[PDB]
Subunit: 385 residues, 4 copies
């Protein structure tokens, strides 16, 4: 039995169908939650769609989470130079836990005993949402209609819609990336069609004039661009526009999913692609060698945690504590030249934290002698190469 | 006391000075060893310079090691997607052990009791050479004149040269990369001058027409390019020309050295930059997820081993065994589009080894339920987020 | 639809009930498979029980797998010094894949289209079995009656038995260990009762006279005990008797399960506890430092793979290749004194492979100087501790 | 040139010789520093020896660091279950940085421009001291007379002593352990003689009556023993006496040194051996699985850092932050039975933090199905085992 559900609501047809199914099947009050995380969608019409579908005004939640997304999710991940399978900048994965947590809290606030979502019943996304929910409200009933209902025909789905009264690609968009799947992308041996890419110019259409930019960092996080101190969303947005302008950040991979097998997708990560390059350059003059190398060793594990939906887990908090500690002296400035898909570092400096700033050749002799000991012992023991 | 030394000889002024110092100070027979590993230098004049300096013909060793470099050093490293500090493709580091081993073997073959080299007395390179020597011949006397002699003035160096009778950058070149240090590069806050780059076109001078290429892989190694089966050096050379043509592979970093602190260098890795991208794409459809992820986790450690000069070590052999085992089914074809600095994957396929090739939503429900158990137990124990 | 099933059959009441349920519900021919892996049970009566229950003679499979268990499963794992959560020697986990693989092969051999087992529907064991099955025969239908049937009462279970015609602890026994769960052990705050331990003397009842033993190793594996070369099962059995005699190998832990939460169990691993100590001692004089340390770093991951049921996986094969490569020169002899629960190393030696077998104080000065560089650079940059 | 040195002074003959050599060779004022860290030596006579040797009263520093040793060095390390090469509890390694840091601070306080120590010129200990010094005072001149002086004869050492006016084993003792090297221990194939062990009873001489103890933990650290809340030194001392009484904590290994090769040593770690066992038991009911497993994976790296002398390093601080974060909910009580060398866990409980505290068999089916997907995809692709 269930009395009141918080639904992740986009205003789209499928979650509108879900909204009606909740009211009828579980016979409950539905609460809607719509979040701005850089989708580039007007929030208002969702309220109106929700109203026309029977939601009470007070049960309609519209929240702008752009700044918080970049501040408490995006920047913290980039401290690690997190990249999944050497290519993927985790744009979908990093955004999920922000949504699930916020939804869980609205549930708590409204007294709602259940939450719900329109994620696929066989994709990564259902896992990401539910792990998040249970981190913040482990007593919540979880309703995944895609997994529950008998509505598994298109015809039996259209019929239901009737009874209860853009780009052709399957897309996920936020301040960090735009994702594309479906259509020709289904064949990983087939190239994408050019008109699919909606956000960034191609490097071919990007300007013939390169552009220099300067990025200021404080404790590993971006704080200014060309001397301009913006809000976190402000900063990532600016980098996006720069990346888009110059055709930066496109990616074509098949990736291993947490749930199911391999999947082919394309991604536009204009700002984040620039962020990663700059952040490495920052660390290169400001981080102790072994501190940087230790974080490199632990990065893939961290990237998989994020990918798989384990942002809100003890593991990840442990890894974050390590990561953050590495970032204390990561203060400085990086200079980059952008040109048709290229992010070239051309300068890095730091006002108080550069380690780029006696020992002699006899000292180096002794360092070599002691590292070579095991090789001499081994050689004498028959283990010559 | 020393009777006979094998010297790494380039024909340059400094190693010519070293050659004379060996003959006089240690009072010995010098053996010269010059190797082609893609430097783009004629080998012959080194023999002639060596002759004019008093080396016996039979003590002059000129060897072409290009194929072996790519086959037994370069390709094996790329199986790991090895990259140092997220940027450096290890062009200098990977080449060193091939030279040190070959030098050690000429020493053994000729009956030479010592080896020698012109590497700096305070750089990474001396370590790389000596670790290698002692892997193959741990009884060898090692003579590092840069560390030993009293010739530490330029004036006292010119005087010695007299008594015993191009690009301004400090460069290291081989089939994998060209390295640049010195001059304006000394200031990491200063951009490089455009005329420094000797190998690759800039992306600005690269053609306005993109180029498609197809790369065939067998067990993780490149075997063909556009259907053409070349020798290993042949293959890497072809990729180099493609990379150079399209302005691919440039890099500007400060890196942490094994010996000493941080150093600013620029690198041209045209072929290798393309290789890495393609190799990831190959693995993306042919490697089991956990096998790929495990290798990712161990990559930085492997990269540091290579960088620091530990190619010929038990560690690295252990890591290689793991790496190679991951590569057994890494057979297939990758398609890429090159354009002004960009290496875009546009297709990947495999004839017999693609894992891209039942479970339902109820199955996914149970997978979620069991992963979420610890979160529910934790939540009940007060550990809600 | 299913025609013929291979059942893991012990002759016990529950798998006898399962055998009858298979014949009736799936309406098929049942094949029985009983394996000796050190349970200390006579195999014969299982054949007779199977006959009385309607199994054809030719569908009764009785196999002795003791030698193979130790040779291809136990010894390979011990090369890694595998221990789960710093205590558990994986006795149950390591035995499972041998059973699942053998069962899968009998299935293939007999033309059987399904396999089945009596493992709990909510324990670790079902996972271990099924991962194994699908490694060897991925087309096999898997029938887990504990998960499938409507027989979830004890009364409805007794009724079924009727219609189709020792220690009180829940135990798992093999050549490596005996496991105990249930009864008083359910409370982790409660001590076990003394009469539970069936295999080993307590240290209190163990003799007042210590015993010296000598263990010979070849490539990391035990090959002889006190000069006696035995079969692999022979060797582990001998160590068991020695361990039992002296009250060695008892353990009391709660452990984290793969499936479900935490569980309290007791374990007797007499031979394996001695094996681990000796194997470390062997490595201490025969393994290169970094090779040993690298294997230590990767051990927990390897232990979890084994625990969770991923013996037959690409990951584990990769890790094994690394592990085995570390073992090449692991030849030698270890001497230990056993006394009332204690395994004390008192000697280790090696005939051709000991690295226990010049450098001076000035050399050490230079080694220190170069390692301390980063600390001096940091100190000058304000980062003093 | 050097004016004033802080010397690590024990009052022994060798550091008394060093004290006189400093005054004469560097022609400086010597400051003495003697620390109590559990050596079981009276501190007073060191002051008197120092006075008779010409040290000013105000330049004699006698400090009790027992509580701080356990609190800020020993307990923090045990949070990680740190053990080196699977055996060594790091008693020497963990104590060093406390001494080096304190010495560096006395140097700073007194205005001393140099520090000095009597550590061997070819052992691990010189490295540990100097890394520590430079963490706290990177400008300090470091004087290692063992590496510097021409006093490398015993006869030329006795002559110097004259001119300027117990157990036979080489031992290191502190609150955590006693170390033994030298004499018969030199041959790793030779057993130690029984009269060498000075701290703990042998298990043979240990009482025939077992003893139960209860250990309370708070955030991963010991806080009480049998209900008794003691100071940190107080706690470790109590555990030592318990361990010694029952013959617990003896160890015989060859270990790999940081500097030089392999070395054979014996160790008595009575309290620490008990601490480790109890701390694992605590974690077993209070730590999330993945948090515990992640810390296990990173333990050897952490142990090597400690061993090699890198306690005061960015790496170690990063690892500590991770380790400490794992310990937040590590509150509870462990019960153990001690008997003749054995540390048996017999109970563990926690008042508010135990995770030992719904899902069904159908849920487990779906968890299995999704983990087995890659095996089925692989099997269909020819990769059957």
């Amino acid at each position: 039995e269930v009395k009141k559900v918080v639904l992740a609501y986009s205003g789209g047809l499928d979650t509108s169908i879900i909204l009606k199914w909740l009211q009828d099947e579980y016979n409950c009050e539905v609460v809607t939650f719509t979040a701005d995380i850089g989708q580039g969608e007007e929030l208002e019409p969702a309220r109106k769609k929700a109203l026309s579908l029977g939601i009470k005004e007070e049960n309609i939640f519209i929240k702008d989470l752009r700044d918080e997304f970049v501040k408490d999710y995006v920047f913290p991940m980039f401290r690690a130079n997190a990249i999944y399978e050497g290519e993927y900048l985790l744009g979908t994965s990093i955004a999920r836990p922000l949504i699930a947590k916020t939804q869980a809290q609205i549930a708590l606030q409204t007294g709602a005993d259940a939450v719900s979502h329109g994620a696929t019943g066989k994709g990564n996304d259902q896992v990401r949402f539910e792990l998040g929910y249970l981190a913040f409200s482990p007593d919540l009933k979880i309703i995944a209609p895609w997994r529950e209902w008998d509505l598994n025909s298109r015809e039996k789905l259209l019929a239901y819609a009737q009874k209860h009264g853009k780009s052709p690609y399957s897309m996920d968009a936020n301040l960090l990336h735009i994702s594309y799947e479906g259509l020709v992308l289904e064949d990983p041996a087939h190239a994408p069609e050019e008109d699919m890419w909606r956000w960034s110019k191609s490097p071919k259409d990007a300007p013939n004039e390169s552009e220099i930019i300067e990025l200021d960092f404080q404790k590993g996080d971006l704080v200014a661009i060309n001397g301009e101190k913006l809000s976190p969303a402000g900063l990532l947005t600016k980098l996006n526009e720069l990346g888009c302008k110059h055709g930066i950040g496109r990616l074509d991979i098949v990736e291993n999913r947490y749930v199911g097998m391999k999947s082919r997708g394309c991604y536009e990560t204009p700002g984040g692609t620039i962020l990663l390059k700059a952040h490495r350059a920052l660390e290169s003059i400001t981080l102790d060698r072994e501190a940087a190398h230790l974080k490199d060793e632990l990065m893939p594990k961290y990237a998989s945690l994020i990918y798989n939906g384990y942002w809100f887990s003890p593991e990840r908090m442990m890894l974050q504590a390590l990561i953050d500690e590495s970032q204390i002296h990561a203060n400085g400035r990086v200079k980059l030249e952008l040109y048709k898909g290229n992010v070239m570092v051309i300068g890095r400096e730091s006002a108080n934290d550069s380690l780029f700033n006696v020992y002699n050749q006899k000292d180096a002799a002794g360092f070599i002698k002691l590292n070579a000991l095991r090789f001499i012992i081994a050689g004498k023991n028959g283990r010559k190469f």
